[PDB]
Amino acid sequence: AVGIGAVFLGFLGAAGSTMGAASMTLTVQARNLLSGIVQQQSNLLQQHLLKLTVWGIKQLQARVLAVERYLRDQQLLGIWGCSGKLICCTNVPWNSSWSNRNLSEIWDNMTWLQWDKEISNYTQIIYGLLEESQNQQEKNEQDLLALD
Amino acid sequence: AVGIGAVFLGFLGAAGSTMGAASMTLTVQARNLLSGIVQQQSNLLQQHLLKLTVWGIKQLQARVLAVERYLRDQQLLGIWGCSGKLICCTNVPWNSSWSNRNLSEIWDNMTWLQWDKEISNYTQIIYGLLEESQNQQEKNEQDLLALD
Amino acid sequence: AVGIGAVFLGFLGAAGSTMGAASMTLTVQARNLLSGIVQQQSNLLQQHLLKLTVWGIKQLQARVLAVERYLRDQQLLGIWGCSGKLICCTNVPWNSSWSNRNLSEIWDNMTWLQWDKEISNYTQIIYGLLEESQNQQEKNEQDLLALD
Amino acid sequence: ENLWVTVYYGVPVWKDAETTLFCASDAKAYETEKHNVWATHACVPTDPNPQEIHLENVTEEFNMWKNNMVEQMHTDIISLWDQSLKPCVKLTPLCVTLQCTNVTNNITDGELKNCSFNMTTELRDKKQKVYSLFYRLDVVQINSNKEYRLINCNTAAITQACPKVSFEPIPIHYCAPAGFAILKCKDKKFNGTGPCPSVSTVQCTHGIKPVVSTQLLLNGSLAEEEVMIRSENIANNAKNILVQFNTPVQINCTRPNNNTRKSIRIGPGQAFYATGDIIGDIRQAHCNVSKATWNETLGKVVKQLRKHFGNNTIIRFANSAGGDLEVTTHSFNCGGEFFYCNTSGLFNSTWISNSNDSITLPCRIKQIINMWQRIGQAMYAPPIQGVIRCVSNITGLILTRDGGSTNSATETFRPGGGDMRDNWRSELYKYKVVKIEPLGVAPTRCKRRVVG
Amino acid sequence: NPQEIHLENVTEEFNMWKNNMVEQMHTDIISLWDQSLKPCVKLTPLCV
Ligand SMILES: *[C@@H]1O[C@H](CO)[C@@H](O[C@@H]2O[C@H](CO)[C@@H](O[C@@H]3O[C@H](CO[C@H]4O[C@H](CO[C@H]5O[C@H](CO)[C@@H](O)[C@H](O)[C@@H]5O)[C@@H](O)[C@H](O)[C@@H]4O)[C@@H](O)[C@H](O[C@H]4O[C@H](CO)[C@@H](O)[C@H](O)[C@@H]4O[C@H]4O[C@H](CO)[C@@H](O)[C@H](O)[C@@H]4O[C@H]4O[C@H](CO)[C@@H](O)[C@H](O)[C@@H]4O)[C@@H]3O)[C@H](O)[C@H]2NC(C)=O)[C@H](O)[C@H]1NC(C)=O
Ligand SMILES: *[C@@H]1O[C@H](CO)[C@@H](O[C@@H]2O[C@H](CO)[C@@H](O[C@@H]3O[C@H](CO[C@H]4O[C@H](CO)[C@@H](O)[C@H](O)[C@@H]4O)[C@@H](O)[C@H](O[C@H]4O[C@H](CO)[C@@H](O)[C@H](O)[C@@H]4O[C@H]4O[C@H](CO)[C@@H](O)[C@H](O)[C@@H]4O[C@H]4O[C@H](CO)[C@@H](O)[C@H](O)[C@@H]4O)[C@@H]3O)[C@H](O)[C@H]2NC(C)=O)[C@H](O)[C@H]1NC(C)=O
Ligand SMILES: *[C@@H]1O[C@H](CO)[C@@H](O[C@@H]2O[C@H](CO)[C@@H](O[C@@H]3O[C@H](CO[C@H]4O[C@H](CO)[C@@H](O)[C@H](O[C@H]5O[C@H](CO)[C@@H](O)[C@H](O)[C@@H]5O[C@H]5O[C@H](CO)[C@@H](O)[C@H](O)[C@@H]5O)[C@@H]4O)[C@@H](O)[C@H](O[C@H]4O[C@H](CO)[C@@H](O)[C@H](O)[C@@H]4O)[C@@H]3O)[C@H](O)[C@H]2NC(C)=O)[C@H](O)[C@H]1NC(C)=O
Ligand SMILES: *[C@@H]1O[C@H](CO)[C@@H](O[C@@H]2O[C@H](CO)[C@@H](O[C@@H]3O[C@H](CO[C@H]4O[C@H](CO)[C@@H](O)[C@H](O[C@H]5O[C@H](CO)[C@@H](O)[C@H](O)[C@@H]5O)[C@@H]4O)[C@@H](O)[C@H](O[C@H]4O[C@H](CO)[C@@H](O)[C@H](O)[C@@H]4O)[C@@H]3O)[C@H](O)[C@H]2NC(C)=O)[C@H](O)[C@H]1NC(C)=O
Ligand SMILES: *[C@@H]1O[C@H](CO)[C@@H](O[C@@H]2O[C@H](CO)[C@@H](O[C@@H]3O[C@H](CO[C@H]4O[C@H](CO)[C@@H](O)[C@H](O[C@H]5O[C@H](CO)[C@@H](O)[C@H](O)[C@@H]5O[C@H]5O[C@H](CO)[C@@H](O)[C@H](O)[C@@H]5O)[C@@H]4O)[C@@H](O)[C@H](O)[C@@H]3O)[C@H](O)[C@H]2NC(C)=O)[C@H](O)[C@H]1NC(C)=O
Numbered sequence: 001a002v003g004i005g006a007v008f009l010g011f012l013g014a015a016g017s018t019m020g021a022a023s024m025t026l027t028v029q030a031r032n033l034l035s036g037i038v039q040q041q042s043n044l045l046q047q048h049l050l051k052l053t054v055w056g057i058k059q060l061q062a063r064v065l066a067v068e069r070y071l072r073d074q075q076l077l078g079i080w081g082c083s084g085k086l087i088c089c090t091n092v093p094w095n096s097s098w099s100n101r102n103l104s105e106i107w108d109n110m111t112w113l114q115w116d117k118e119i120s121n122y123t124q125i126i127y128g129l130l131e132e133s134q135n136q137q138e139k140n141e142q143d144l145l146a147l148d
Numbered sequence: 149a150v151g152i153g154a155v156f157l158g159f160l161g162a163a164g165s166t167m168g169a170a171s172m173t174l175t176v177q178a179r180n181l182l183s184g185i186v187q188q189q190s191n192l193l194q195q196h197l198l199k200l201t202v203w204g205i206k207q208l209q210a211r212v213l214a215v216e217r218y219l220r221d222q223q224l225l226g227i228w229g230c231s232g233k234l235i236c237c238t239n240v241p242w243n244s245s246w247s248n249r250n251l252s253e254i255w256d257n258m259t260w261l262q263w264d265k266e267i268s269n270y271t272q273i274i275y276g277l278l279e280e281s282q283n284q285q286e287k288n289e290q291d292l293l294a295l296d
Numbered sequence: 297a298v299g300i301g302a303v304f305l306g307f308l309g310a311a312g313s314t315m316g317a318a319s320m321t322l323t324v325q326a327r328n329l330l331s332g333i334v335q336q337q338s339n340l341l342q343q344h345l346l347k348l349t350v351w352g353i354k355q356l357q358a359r360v361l362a363v364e365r366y367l368r369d370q371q372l373l374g375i376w377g378c379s380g381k382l383i384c385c386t387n388v389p390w391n392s393s394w395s396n397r398n399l400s401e402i403w404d405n406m407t408w409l410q411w412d413k414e415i416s417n418y419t420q421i422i423y424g425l426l427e428e429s430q431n432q433q434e435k436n437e438q439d440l441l442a443l444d
Numbered sequence: 445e446n447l448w449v450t451v452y453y454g455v456p457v458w459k460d461a462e463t464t465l466f467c468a469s470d471a472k473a474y475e476t477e478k479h480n481v482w483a484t485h486a487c488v489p490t491d492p493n494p495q496e497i498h499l500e501n502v503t504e505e506f507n508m509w510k511n512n513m514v515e516q517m518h519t520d521i522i523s524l525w526d527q528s529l530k531p532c533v534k535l536t537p538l539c540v541t542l543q544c545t546n547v548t549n550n551i552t553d554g555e556l557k558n559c560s561f562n563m564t565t566e567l568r569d570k571k572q573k574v575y576s577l578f579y580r581l582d583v584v585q586i587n588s589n590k591e592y593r594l595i596n597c598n599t600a601a602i603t604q605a606c607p608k609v610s611f612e613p614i615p616i617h618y619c620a621p622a623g624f625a626i627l628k629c630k631d632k633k634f635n636g637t638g639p640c641p642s643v644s645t646v647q648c649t650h651g652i653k654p655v656v657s658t659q660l661l662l663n664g665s666l667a668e669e670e671v672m673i674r675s676e677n678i679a680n681n682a683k684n685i686l687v688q689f690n691t692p693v694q695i696n697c698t699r700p701n702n703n704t705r706k707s708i709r710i711g712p713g714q715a716f717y718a719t720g721d722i723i724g725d726i727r728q729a730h731c732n733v734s735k736a737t738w739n740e741t742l743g744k745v746v747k748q749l750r751k752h753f754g755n756n757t758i759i760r761f762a763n764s765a766g767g768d769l770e771v772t773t774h775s776f777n778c779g780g781e782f783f784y785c786n787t788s789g790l791f792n793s794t795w796i797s798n799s800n801d802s803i804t805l806p807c808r809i810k811q812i813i814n815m816w817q818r819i820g821q822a823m824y825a826p827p828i829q830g831v832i833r834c835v836s837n838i839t840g841l842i843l844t845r846d847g848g849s850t851n852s853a854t855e856t857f858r859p860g861g862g863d864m865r866d867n868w869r870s871e872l873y874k875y876k877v878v879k880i881e882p883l884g885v886a887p888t889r890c891k892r893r894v895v896g
Numbered sequence: 897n898p899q900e901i902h903l904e905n906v907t908e909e910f911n912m913w914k915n916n917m918v919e920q921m922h923t924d925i926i927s928l929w930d931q932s933l934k935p936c937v938k939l940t941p942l943c944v
């Protein structure tokens with residue numbers, strides 16, 4: 001209806017804003033990602049026998065896909081050492097053949113969507129060892145160094 | 149049958165005990181929360197064709213609701229920085245218009261159920277920024293301070 | 297077909313190798329554990345009405361069991377303080393009535409399968425207090441000691 | 445001057461997502477009658493408030509033509525019909541040969557018939573003759589005094605709709621799940637495809653009522669604009685046109701016969717709904733339009749299409765000239781029996797170089813329909829008793845050119861309605877589902893202690 | 897073994913009249929009957 005301007009800004013409300021602005025609004029995304037219970041109730045908000053109407057089970061397929069792609073996403077975080085923590089710093093340098101531009105030149109200049117588009121091709125290969133050189137051989141260390 | 153008194157005390161066995169007592173028995177709850185495999189087996193513990201008896205799929209609806217409400221609960225912990233850790237300390241002060249009473253006056257005096265009842269109304273509003281003022285702007289800090 | 301030897305080594309490719317070798321290849325297992333989306337697509341890679349063919353829903357039963365046994369496994373890690381971290385050190389001593397042999401005598405001598413077989417009987421009892429004496433009463437401490 | 449590549453959870457990001465969506469509609473208790481067509485009791489209730497939030501300076505593509513939510517939103521509608529029918533009574537003991545001729549009237553205007561006829565009673569070897577009243581289209585002849593057979597008997601079976609269920613359309617809000625999101629476009633002059641500069645975020649559709657209509661749409665959404673309307677590619681004739689208004693004009697379809705009915709028992713629990721005696725006048729099904737508004741809403745539909753065939757060119761119109769009985773004329777539902785009017789008065793004008801006078805449009809009523817162009821078990825529509833009267837709110841129409849002739853001299857064209865899902869493009873063109881890709885790696889200077 | 901464990905000094909409401917598990921526990925019993933019947937023989941040639 002008529003626009004009300006009381007709350008700011010909202011889920012993906014920073015998609016049209018640069019990465020620096022949205023980098024601060026990471027949580028108005030993280031809660032809306034998984035929650036398939038706030039919006040769908042275990043029991044409803046008598047002629048029918050059982051509820052295998054296809055409103056029933058293809059709602060049912062949706063709820064798990066809601067979680068599993070989250071659940072495998074957050075496992076990637078469990079691979080890289082960031083489980084309960086939304087941002088994550090990183091040890092292996094960036095050799096910039098994936099992008100030649102600066103630090104200001106992205107957070108102030110572009111947006112998140114406008115950054116994936118360009119390295120969408122280099123995406124899989126990086127995730128190869130943001131754990132291996134970062135975590136696979138981060139903790140044989142404190143294995144071999146808490147050894148004493 | 150006749151009561152046997154060998155094990156102590158059990159799942160929610162500290163619900164009738166004060167918060168301090170139950171605060172130590174947080175794990176006899178955390179394992180019984182999700183485990184829908186210990187009690188339900190992937191294959192059973194030949195005339196039938198397939199098992200779409202409604203024992204089959206409304207058992208099936210139950211298992212995911214078992215996880216997703218856990219999974220969204222533990223995401224709230226992932227929002228507040230406590231993923232693998234059951235208790236969690238906290239930075240933003242408590243202004244006590246939500247409850248005027250003391251520290252001893254709850255853990256020794258009341259129980260957990262007997263504490264939610266009174267602030268059940270103030271529940272949603274607090275969860276607004278036990279992350280924002282606690283974690284949303286806890287790590288732009290070490291973003292801006294591991295900057296060097 | 298004919299064997300190609302370009303990649304090394306792979307999922308469970310260290311099952312025939314000693315625990316020390318496989319102890320370094322823990323991640324070529326952790327990603328293949330949950331991922332039921334990489335291999336199964338939310339929409340397919342028109343005469344039919346709806347897809348309740350039993351290819352549909354007993355694929356559907358499989359995906360959740362894929363996650364829940366992971367999800368309850370990784371909860372055990374959330375019980376022991378290791379959520380995002382694959383290996384985990386430990387405080388309560390090992391009294392060795394569960395195995396009399398050495399430290400070299402397992403990582404260099406045996407493999408992982410060849411270690412569970414022998415303490416498969418002592419398995420449940422240990423998990424009793426790799427949290428209680430390790431974590432249940434690890435953080436009433438920093439409760440009582442961050443008290444100040 | 446050293447650069448690390450560090451990750452972030454919850455980045456506003458999205459991908460063209462293909463996934464199955466779900467419906468949410470505010471629940472009507474409605475303990476009087478029961479069982480809605482589609483919503484039934486399974487659709488989840490809409491939240492007290494569905495949150496709408498503006499995506500600022502965002503511009504994102506939209507192509508409603510390879511859009512999938514329509515192929516879904518009819519995939520459903522066909523489906524659950526075939527399960528709202530299956531519990532209802534199966535009408536195969538009726539394909540019997542059941543003699544009749546014309547109905548009592550001074551011979552004026554295949555008005556209707558009245559057959560008297562064999563049937564099986566609740567008891568097996570027991571039979572009975574009783575009478576009913578059919579319409580021209582439901583039956584076709586073969587040979588005596590005289591007698592015909594039911595038009596579908598030729599090729600398909602029939603399951604009569606349970607009159608307990610009703611086909612009054614209600615708003616349906618399709619919903620994308622967590623891990624995805626729909627999204628709406630929000631500029632009024634937006635045409636069929638292109639990126640939308642004004643965008644705001646929804647997760648569940650506004651209330652779409654699934655009106656079963658061929659060649660026209662009505663009681664639909666209405667843009668605050670001057671009715672600018674799109675094709676898959678206007679340059680070609682074969683691909684349809686889909687108008688929809690800016691101020692709706694009223695439509696009231698009528699037949700003022702008070703039908704009577706009579707439950708009669710075919711067998712164990714099966715009760716066939718025979719139409720009974722007519723009491724009162726004989727009166728044909730029709731529909732009123734005041735041209736005053738029609739020709740002037742027409743008038744604005746006139747001038748805008750011009751912007752694609754030159755500002756100096758012919759335009760044209762007359763009636764549908766191709767296809768079957770059901771789609772050449774206005775197929776739709778009103779109150780329980782379906783209509784089929786030649787839209788003759790309407791497509792009546794040429795407008796070049798830029799007292800009530802109400803149109804009245806004769807229709808014929810059907811009872812047994814092979815809908816959605818699907819051969820197979822038919823549906824017998826039970827009659828409707830007493831008067832009928834349905835008001836209406838024209839919002840749009842569907843049209844198709846005829847093609848080959850001299851360019852720009854005088855090309856002609858005509859409403860087509862070759863498929864229905866153009867009914868779904870009517871109000872599913874703001875919307876587009878999209879994936880959540882919420883995690884992004886990006887380079888900053890922070891990094892925690894190198895533990896060595 | 898199903899584990900039974902006493903909740904000590906706990907007092908909690910009970911209203912068996914708007915209780916739902918009954919409306920379920922008959923919702924079932926009606927239901928699966930109508931699927932233990934459907935595979936069995938249909939007796940309409942007998943109303944003779
Ligand atoms: C464009 O938009 C337009 C604007 O909305 C649309 O116009 C709509 O058109 C539809 C028809 O297609 C209308 O639906 C029908 O309207 C009838 C007229 O409503 C008058 O009465 C209203 C008050 O009474 C209604 O409401 C009360 C609850 O408040 C209810 O108890 C009552 O039964 C009745 O429904 C009044 O407010 C209005 O202003 C009107 O004056 C209405 O009578 C119709 O109800 C029928 O039909 C439907 C369809 O099958 C059934 O689902 C209903 O249950 C009911 O049928 C029952 O009653 C009949 C009465 O004779 C019986 O013959 C039936 O067999 C049946 O009775 C059985 O079942 C009962 C319940 O179990 C038992 O008690 C009986 O004993 C029997 O067993 C229906 O609502 C819309 O109303 C109309 N809109 C508006 C706003 O009026 C237009 O259609 C749109 N265009 C398109 C293309 O869609
Ligand atoms: C398609 O069909 C639709 C539907 O048929 C068409 O749209 C409808 O068109 C109607 C116009 O013909 C319109 O309704 C009418 O409203 C008139 C009032 O308008 C005039 O007066 C007002 C001021 O009062 C002016 O503002 C206005 O400009 C006009 O000058 C009524 O006069 C009409 O008829 C009376 O009878 C009808 C029954 O048909 C009643 O419903 C109506 O109310 C009228 O008066 C009685 O009822 C009222 C209360 O309802 C009483 O106050 C009054 O004294 C009368 O008394 C009776 O009732 C009382 C109880 O209240 C009782 O004590 C007493 O004894 C009497 O029994 C007529 O109603 C519709 O609104 C309109 N519908 C829609 C949806 O737009 C459409 O045009 C058609 N289209 C085409 C293309 O054909
Ligand atoms: C939906 O509703 C609309 C609204 O009407 C319908 O539109 C009608 O559609 C039909 C299609 O079936 C059209 O019929 C076709 O008409 C032509 C013209 O008819 C001529 O041929 C017949 C012989 O077949 C002559 O008898 C006619 O005679 C008229 O003119 C002479 C003088 O010229 C006069 O002596 C006659 O009395 C009659 O005139 C009277 O009426 C006219 C106005 O109509 C008036 O000017 C005059 O003063 C008198 O009042 C006429 O010359 C016809 O040839 C076509 O032939 C087809 O059928 C015949 C058999 O009848 C076959 O021989 C032939 O091979 C074809 O098969 C069509 O019948 C009709 O014109 C049209 N009307 C309008 C107003 O558009 C839609 O059809 C409806 N749709 C559906 C699906 O129901
Ligand atoms: C549905 O489709 C079926 C398919 O055939 C249609 O068939 C009809 O079947 C019936 C029974 O098989 C046919 O009945 C015929 O009746 C005539 C004359 O009957 C009159 O005279 C009889 C004495 O001769 C008398 O018994 C009759 O009824 C009396 O008794 C009843 C009570 O029992 C009472 O209600 C009456 O008032 C009378 O008191 C009636 O008065 C008969 O001549 C026919 O010939 C047969 O039998 C003779 C020997 O008698 C034999 O020589 C013939 O070869 C033939 O075998 C037969 O009995 C009926 O005629 C069929 N229909 C037509 C058009 O002929 C059926 O009608 C369709 N609709 C339905 C069933 O609703
Ligand atoms: C479209 O077409 C339908 C037809 O189906 C019309 O529906 C009819 O509308 C009229 C309104 O004009 C209704 O009449 C009303 O009935 C109610 C209730 O009736 C009670 O009260 C009346 C007196 O007012 C009374 O007549 C009724 O009693 C019946 O039984 C009595 C014996 O106990 C007997 O004395 C009486 O006369 C009547 O039976 C008679 O009829 C039968 C055959 O029909 C005959 O065998 C018998 O011997 C008698 O002669 C009853 O107590 C009243 O309150 C109203 O005042 C008004 O009379 C019709 O009932 C109704 N019919 C149906 C089937 O619905 C639609 O209106 C029409 N609409 C349009 C828009 O055209």
Ligand SMILES: *[C@@H]1O[C@H](CO)[C@@H](O[C@@H]2O[C@H](CO)[C@@H](O[C@@H]3O[C@H](CO)[C@@H](O)[C@H](O)[C@@H]3O)[C@H](O)[C@H]2NC(C)=O)[C@H](O)[C@H]1NC(C)=O
Binds near residue numbers: 117118119121122
């Ligand atoms: C993302 O990575 C992919 C893979 O490297 C890049 O795609 C490649 O882009 C080049 C264009 O520079 C394409 O080369 C062209 O090939 C034709 C012959 O087929 C040649 O005539 C042209 O002159 C040109 O060289 C190449 O085909 C294409 N390959 C694939 C697999 O897509 C892409 O450019 C990268 N995108 C960004 C934004 O970095």
Ligand SMILES: *[C@@H]1O[C@H](CO)[C@@H](O[C@@H]2O[C@H](CO)[C@@H](O[C@@H]3O[C@H](CO)[C@@H](O)[C@H](O)[C@@H]3O)[C@H](O)[C@H]2NC(C)=O)[C@H](O)[C@H]1NC(C)=O
Binds near residue numbers: 265266267269270
């Ligand atoms: C939890 O928070 C809610 C919301 O503030 C509290 O509910 C409110 O309680 C007051 C009682 O103090 C109710 O006020 C009453 O209103 C009537 C008029 O309607 C007036 O005549 C009475 O004298 C009294 O003032 C108020 O209606 C009620 N509001 C709601 C929405 O429930 C509740 O008390 C809080 N509970 C605890 C334990 O703190």
Ligand SMILES: *[C@@H]1O[C@H](CO)[C@@H](O[C@@H]2O[C@H](CO)[C@@H](O[C@@H]3O[C@H](CO)[C@@H](O)[C@H](O)[C@@H]3O)[C@H](O)[C@H]2NC(C)=O)[C@H](O)[C@H]1NC(C)=O
Binds near residue numbers: 414
């Ligand atoms: C894992 O733990 C189980 C439980 O302690 C061990 O199983 C036990 O093994 C002994 C063999 O040393 C079995 O004892 C035998 O009993 C018969 C009489 O029934 C006796 O005649 C034999 O001389 C022998 O003493 C015992 O039955 C068996 N119990 C169970 C429950 O399996 C098992 O050996 C352990 N495995 C390893 C690898 O440590």
Ligand SMILES: *[C@@H]1O[C@H](CO)[C@@H](O[C@@H]2O[C@H](CO)[C@@H](O[C@@H]3O[C@H](CO)[C@@H](O)[C@H](O)[C@@H]3O)[C@H](O)[C@H]2NC(C)=O)[C@H](O)[C@H]1NC(C)=O
Binds near residue numbers: 555
């Ligand atoms: C009352 O019922 C009779 C049927 O028993 C209707 O008579 C029918 O009249 C039409 C013409 O009005 C005849 O149609 C003819 O069709 C042939 C092609 O099949 C065509 O070449 C002729 O020029 C004519 O159009 C039809 O054969 C005839 N039915 C018969 C003889 O069985 C009569 O029209 C009905 N009453 C009303 C008012 O319609």
Ligand SMILES: *[C@@H]1O[C@H](CO)[C@@H](O[C@@H]2O[C@H](CO)[C@@H](O)[C@H](O)[C@H]2NC(C)=O)[C@H](O)[C@H]1NC(C)=O
Binds near residue numbers: 663692836837
């Ligand atoms: C028919 O169209 C009107 C708008 O032309 C829709 O809204 C009605 O608008 C009139 C004034 O323009 C108001 O007096 C009515 O109260 C409005 N009705 C409603 C229900 O909002 C109307 O909704 C349309 N009818 C439908 C959709 O059935």
Ligand SMILES: *[C@@H]1O[C@H](CO)[C@@H](O[C@@H]2O[C@H](CO)[C@@H](O)[C@H](O)[C@H]2NC(C)=O)[C@H](O)[C@H]1NC(C)=O
Binds near residue numbers: 788789790791792793
């Ligand atoms: C426009 O269409 C109408 C029919 O909707 C035509 O109206 C006919 O006009 C004559 C008067 O010459 C009337 O006697 C007829 O009764 C009308 N027919 C009908 C079916 O109502 C009208 O001729 C058309 N005009 C043009 C130029 O196409």
Ligand SMILES: *[C@@H]1O[C@H](CO)[C@@H](O)[C@H](O)[C@H]1NC(C)=O
Binds near residue numbers: 754
């Ligand atoms: C003007 O009309 C002619 C034919 O009358 C047509 O060929 C030409 O395209 C038109 N020009 C414009 C600009 O519409």
